[PDB]
Design a binder for these strands. Structure first.
Ligand SMILES: [Mg+2]
Ligand SMILES: [Mg+2]
Ligand SMILES: [Mg+2]
Ligand SMILES: [Mg+2]
Ligand SMILES: [Mg+2]
Ligand SMILES: [Mg+2]
Ligand SMILES: [Mg+2]
Ligand SMILES: [Mg+2]
Ligand SMILES: [Mg+2]
Ligand SMILES: [Mg+2]
Ligand SMILES: [Mg+2]
Ligand SMILES: [Mg+2]
Ligand SMILES: [Mg+2]
Ligand SMILES: [Mg+2]
Ligand SMILES: [Mg+2]
Ligand SMILES: [Mg+2]
Ligand SMILES: [Mg+2]
Ligand SMILES: [Mg+2]
Ligand SMILES: [Mg+2]
Ligand SMILES: [Mg+2]
Ligand SMILES: [Mg+2]
Ligand SMILES: [Mg+2]
Ligand SMILES: [Mg+2]
Ligand SMILES: [Mg+2]
Ligand SMILES: [Mg+2]
Ligand SMILES: [Mg+2]
Ligand SMILES: [Mg+2]
Ligand SMILES: [Mg+2]
Lengths: 177, 206, 262, 143
RNA sequence: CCUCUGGCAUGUUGGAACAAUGUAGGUAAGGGAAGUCGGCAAGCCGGAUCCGUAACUUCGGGAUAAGGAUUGGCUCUAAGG
RNA sequence: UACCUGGUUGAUCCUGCCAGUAGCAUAUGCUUGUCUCAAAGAUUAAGCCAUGCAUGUCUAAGUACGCACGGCCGGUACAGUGAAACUGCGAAUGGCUCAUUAAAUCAGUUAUGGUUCCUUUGGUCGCUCGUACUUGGAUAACUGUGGUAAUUCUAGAGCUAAUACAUGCCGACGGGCGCUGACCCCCUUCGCGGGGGGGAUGCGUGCAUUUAUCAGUGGUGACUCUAGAUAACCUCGGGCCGAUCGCACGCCCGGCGGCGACGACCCAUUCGAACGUCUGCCCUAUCAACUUUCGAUGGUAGUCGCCGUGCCUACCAUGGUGACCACGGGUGACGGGGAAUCAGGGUUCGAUUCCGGAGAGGGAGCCUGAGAAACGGCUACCACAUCCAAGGAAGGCAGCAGGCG
RNA sequence: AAGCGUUUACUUUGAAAAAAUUAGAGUGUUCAAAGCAGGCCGCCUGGAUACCGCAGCUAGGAAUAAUGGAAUAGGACCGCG
RNA sequence: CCGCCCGUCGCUACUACCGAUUGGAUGGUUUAGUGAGGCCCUCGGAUCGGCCCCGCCGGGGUGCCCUGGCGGAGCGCUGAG
């Protein structure tokens, strides 16, 4: 059973663990489950204790220091390319993204670059033009409809005012009967 | 949990409903908010239909409308003094709908002295040497001075309100439901309801 | 049930779709849309049972999803779309236009329409709403919220909507003398002139309506859809023209016509 | 007369304390041709649940009954009296449903036996769903 | 049970020890009448408030039946002239 | 097809049953050649279950640096199929059973003017006056060290994306609209004064939320409706005003562009859900009074709730139901559409394929979600029960087959 | 034509009543139970109709059965102060 | 009428009833004690960041400002938890 942070005791406990907690992975959205974990403070009675070397000693160790393992994937966000290879906002990112070589048994040697997201392409700029063109279309439609309804309501209220003026003049001449 | 269901209780005939289903989720009750007076803390409950309710838990301010003058300002809640339901909800200071709180009358004092340019409160003999209240009360134009001189005929207030301004804090009624909305809004008591709640308070005082 | 139901049974489907009894346990639960469930006729039923352009559910799916069926001037792709009253089917490729008008009995009738008639439809308004800046709103029988209408259009009138724009072209007002198609009840599909309007506060107001052949009959006002000034409609009428000849006259007409056919 | 109880008793849509130099009271007609009584306009009472001067809306059904008990606070019990038909014995049986109805205090003099008319509304309490809309006096008893 | 006015000098002696048997108070793990003629002696319970109270019966009782719960100090609120 | 017949007597005429008579379901016997339909672990044990399966899902249109396959045209990123995993959605439908349940469910009926509602269709979506040629840091999948006897267990390290998670402005935008108003200018007047405009500067300036006030565009039988005006608030467990994706590829001289996909506050719409109104339920009096300061029936004020409401709390009132059968009990009782038998009435049945309800061994509590008090989700406890290295782990056939009883 | 006409029970009509079942129309499933099909040398057509007690809603009738009104005149009507 | 016929007693079988045993076993409702678990509130703060404060400086502006790297540390503030 794994060790997890902040339990702060010596023995083994049982916790309800959820999304965002460690030593647990949910299956359904919203699932919580009593799993049994081990506290922070340590003793002999465990198999594996994990260590992270945080300051290199003055002498080498062969298993850990001599060989080096590079990062496997190059960066993919455009500003992360910028802040890796130290770019401004004018130099082209796409020639500066890392590409990998490809060599195996019986196949052609290749190279492979990630499809970098968040670069500014003319399709993104076209969509940003399209939404504000659509906005001005919507205000033009709104002012057009409002003006033609204003003309129509002026005409209908002119009709109703002339109708009641007909009533008042007709019953004045009926009073003159 | 806490249930809100008629099926757990007797008929009109005093009978006994035996239930035909267990507790449902639309038959749900959650515990009381009991909004005290303190620096603002509001938790958010998500409710039926995915909406949000705002439990205040401790709460200091709220905008009160003094509506005979129609001035509505954000004000600091001083105290709970009267509650028509439960006197221990006065004894602990719990903000609920239609309870009587007290609020500091400084924004309404500022508005009255800036609109009518007459003092209220103001035990006579002192003048604020920071001089800003009298630069608010004096030195206007001869076009605007007739506007103030015609608005100062409608500038006499109720004496109950005025002694509340002189003491510095007003009686007011909470209108909103602070366990539901998250706010402690309401209105300043003036009038026959003010005299009603004042005689209630001093009869309780004995 | 712990939520909304998604399946609909074959026997529990509405009768005016005229589903049969022994194909399958189910009937297509129509998707939510502008028309009610018990007052619609879905697109799978319209293409499969009525027109016989499709044989199976896969065939009506591939017809509706190679983008050929154009309901109300718009492309509607799901096969369980509720095609309701006064909707206009535009079969583009095969070149037809249908208007889902009711029959002399309770059916929806396959009713072929010229394109110059099929570019409008007629809609009964259900509500007058006023939006946020004094903006009037019609709410028709098929969920159209139409902002800025004519102020002479009131709550039980009908409007002639142009389809590619959605705007009002003209309107008929609910008065005595105008026509009526009847959308609901035991008198479903009948056509007559409105004889009488009887006001019941709180209850459902009831309208007496008289057809061409001197038969007068009542109907609640929610089931009444005016379709023109006087006797003159603003759409076409189906075969029989909403008369409901009796069962004796139907017997006499079928044996007369088919002994004349031989 | 007024302000019996703990809180202040006022009508919620009226603003009564506007600056001067008798209160107006809120009242409405409930529809269906029910004449609002003169004591509702001329009164001084408050009521949440009066159909004429309060926050209820008479909808649905409009029934009748005879006043049979008035022992409660601002609600009475009416006794709807009807017959019921058995398909076997072609006869009837006299049944009844007592039901509690909120009687507004604008109907100021009513004695038991009077045939009142009630209207369905918002459920005012646990077993109360109607209001007395009009009161017709019992036969005789004009003195 | 403790105290004030009043009264007295511990009831026909004092001192020093703190052994057995006593006489008179107590306490006891674990078990709970296995002791003995017999629960002898001891022990349990115990006041008040709120509930709850069976058989039987002369209808009066049984009855505080049995069985439960609450109880302090302090800061208050409400009702009773 | 509105049917009777044998039997008490030595014989008769009657009341009266017993027994014959015809169905109709369940079992059971003996018998069985064709063919079309078709019920089938309901009754007893809503008793217990070995095993396998019963809810998963990819479009041009959210993420694609797994050579996992692959095309060449490169070097100006990503051709294109594409497992995996994050994200989104569904898993609340369906199916099974009928244990509970007797004004309860349910049926007809109306109401929500007393509420919520993913979705789909239609509105809305520069109305706000105050790095945008695109902002940030983590994480799975992948590599690499593992642990346990064992689980759909998961840990420490490296990397890396978003329509995940966050942050956040530019454009409209040049002023209008309401306040405050320094001041400016004119007519009358001995004159204070009155009347009249213009107005720099500063404050507020959209939809939604919350409060209060004023007036009375469009509605209903009826609003405290809708819409207007005003004074303010706007929740840091924050409400909107788009930092998203795919096809074609044109036009002004960098800027304009069309067709869509997704998502969003609100308003309708659809499917509904949810409480309510009137009326209707079988046997039982060897059940005649029941309910109440432990809510019973009302009032006033709150709390909670999605809403109305004794739903709950506080303080008052002493009510409420009952021979017109309450209350208590029983049911070999889920309700209805319906089935059998029938002259007319009736009598009996309805677990059973459609609708409504209830439940997942018994009770209870919840997370996620628009919708669940979900059990082919979780946590306890009781009964049961599986694996084991004895420390632990895992379960729910009244789903389909099948097994025991 | 809009608003009003003591009220119920009864009667008649209209509305609204979910399909399935039941009754029943059409139709040579080879007949029948069934099924909503099918027919003519592309066209022709079907996929009806009735019943659905009780309660509720609407409009006619006014016999029967109830109920009322004017009797300490607190009565209609008609105009006047 | 040598007909029929009724009861006790004696034998046999069967079904019930009363019956000391404060009898026995199963259900169901429930007063009262103990009470797991979830949810809410009041705390808590394992851990993880962010901003300031200095020292050493590289890239840039008219000795102050911003950056990018190295550290150190008050934990001065601050956020999640
Ligand atoms: Mg009969
Ligand atoms: Mg002594
Ligand atoms: Mg002595
Ligand atoms: Mg002596
Ligand atoms: Mg001992
Ligand atoms: Mg002991
Ligand atoms: Mg012995
Ligand atoms: Mg002994
Ligand atoms: Mg003794
Ligand atoms: Mg005794
Ligand atoms: Mg005999
Ligand atoms: Mg014989
Ligand atoms: Mg027999
Ligand atoms: Mg053969
Ligand atoms: Mg079984
Ligand atoms: Mg289901
Ligand atoms: Mg039973
Ligand atoms: Mg049962
Ligand atoms: Mg059934
Ligand atoms: Mg059964
Ligand atoms: Mg069912
Ligand atoms: Mg369930
Ligand atoms: Mg079982
Ligand atoms: Mg469950
Ligand atoms: Mg299962
Ligand atoms: Mg399920
Ligand atoms: Mg099956
Ligand atoms: Mg039917």
């Amino acid at each position: 059973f794994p060790m997890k942070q902040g339990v702060l005791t010596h023995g083994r406990v049982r916790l309800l663990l959820s999304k965002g907690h460690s030593c647990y992975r949910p299956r359904r959205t919203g699932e919580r489950k009593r799993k049994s974990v081990r506290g922070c403070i340590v003793d002999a009675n465990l198999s594996v204790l994990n260590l992270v070397i945080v300051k290199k000693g003055e002498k080498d160790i062969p298993g850990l220091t001599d060989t080096t393992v590079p990062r496997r994937l190059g960066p993919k966000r455009a500003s992360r390319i910028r802040k890796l290879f130290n770019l401004s906002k004018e130099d082209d990112v796409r020639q500066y993204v890392v590409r990998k070589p490809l060599n195996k048994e019986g196949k052609k040697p290749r190279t492979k670059a990630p499809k970098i997201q968040r670069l500014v392409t003319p399709r993104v700029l076209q969509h940003k033009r399209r939404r504000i063109a659509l906005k001005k279309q919507r205000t033009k439609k709104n002012k057009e409809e409002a003006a033609e309804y204003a003309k129509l309501l002026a005409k209908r209220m002119k009709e109703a005012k002339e109708k009641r003026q007909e009533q008042i003049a007709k019953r004045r001449r009926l009073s003159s009967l | 949990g806490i249930s809100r269901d008629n099926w757990h209780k007797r008929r009109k005939t005093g009978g006994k409903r035996k239930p035909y289903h267990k507790k449902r989720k639309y038959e749900l009750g959650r515990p009381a908010a009991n909004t005290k007076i303190g620096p603002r803390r509001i938790h958010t409950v998500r409710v039926r239909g995915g909406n949000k309710k705002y439990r205040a838990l401790r709460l200091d301010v709220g905008n009160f409308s003094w509506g005979s003058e129609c001035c509505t300002r954000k004000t600091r809640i001083i105290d709970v003094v009267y509650n028509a339901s439960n006197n221990e909800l006065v004894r602990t200071k719990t903000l609920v709908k239609n309870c009587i709180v007290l609020i500091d009358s400084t924004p309404y004092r500022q508005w009255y002295e800036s609109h009518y340019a007459l003092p209220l409160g103001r035990k006579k003999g002192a003048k604020l040497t920071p001089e800003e209240e009298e630069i608010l009360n004096k030195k206007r134009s001869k076009k605007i001075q007739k506007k103030y001189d015609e608005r100062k005929k409608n500038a006499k207030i109720s004496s109950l309100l005025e002694e509340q301004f002189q003491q510095g804090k007003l009686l007011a009624c909470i209108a909103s439901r602070p366990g539901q909305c998250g706010r402690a809004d309401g209105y300043v008591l003036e009038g026959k309801e003010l005299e009603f709640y004042l005689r209630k308070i001093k009869a309780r005082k004995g | 049930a712990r939520g909304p139901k998604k399946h609909l049974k074959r026997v529990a489907a509405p009768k005016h779709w005229m589903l049969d009894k022994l194909t399958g346990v189910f009937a297509p639960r129509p998707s939510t849309g502008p028309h009610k469930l018990r007052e619609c006729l879905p697109l799978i039923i319209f293409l499969r049972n009525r027109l016989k352009y499709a044989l199976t559910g896969d065939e009506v799916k591939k017809i509706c999803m190679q983008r050929f069926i154009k309901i109300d001037g718009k492309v509607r792709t799901d096969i369980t779309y509720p095609a309701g009253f006064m909707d206009v089917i535009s079969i583009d490729k095969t070149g037809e236009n249908f208007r889902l008008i009711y029959d002399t009995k309770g059916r929806f009738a396959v009713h072929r329409i010229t394109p110059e008639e099929a570019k409008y439809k007629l809609c009964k308004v259900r509500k007058i709403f006023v939006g946020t800046k004094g903006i009037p709103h019609l709410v028709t029988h098929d969920a159209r919220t139409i902002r800025y209408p004519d102020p002479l259009i009131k709550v039980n009138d009908t409007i002639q909507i142009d389809l590619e724009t959605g705007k009002i072209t003209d309107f008929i007002k609910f008065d005595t003398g105008n026509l009526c198609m009847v959308t609901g009840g035991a008198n479903l599909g009948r056509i007559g002139v409105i004889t009488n309007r009887e006001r019941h506060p709180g209850s459902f107001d009831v309208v007496h309506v008289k057809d061409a052949n001197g038969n007068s009959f009542a109907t609640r006002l929610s089931n009444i859809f005016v379709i023109g000034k006087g006797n003159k409609p603003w759409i076409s009428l189906p075969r029989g023209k909403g008369i409901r000849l009796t069962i004796a006259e139907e017997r006499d007409k079928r044996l007369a016509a088919k002994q004349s056919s031989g | 007369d007024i302000q019996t109880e703990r809180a202040y008793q006022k009508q919620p849509t009226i603003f009564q304390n506007k600056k001067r130099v008798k209160l107006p009271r809120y009242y409405k007609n409930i529809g269906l041709g029910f004449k609002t009584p003169k004591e509702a306009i001329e009164g001084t009472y408050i009521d949440k649940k009066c159909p004429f001067t309060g926050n209820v809306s008479i909808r649905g059904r409009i029934l009748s009954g005879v006043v049979t008990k008035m022992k409660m606070q601002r609600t009475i019990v009416i006794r709807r009296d009807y017959l019921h038909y058995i398909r076997k014995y072609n006869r009837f049986e006299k049944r009844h449903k007592n039901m509690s109805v909120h009687l507004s205090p604008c109907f100021r003099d009513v004695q038991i036996g009077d045939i009142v008319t009630v209207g369905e509304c918002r459920p005012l309490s646990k077993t109360v769903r109607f209001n007395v809309l009009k009161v017709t006096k019992a036969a005789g008893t004009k003195k």
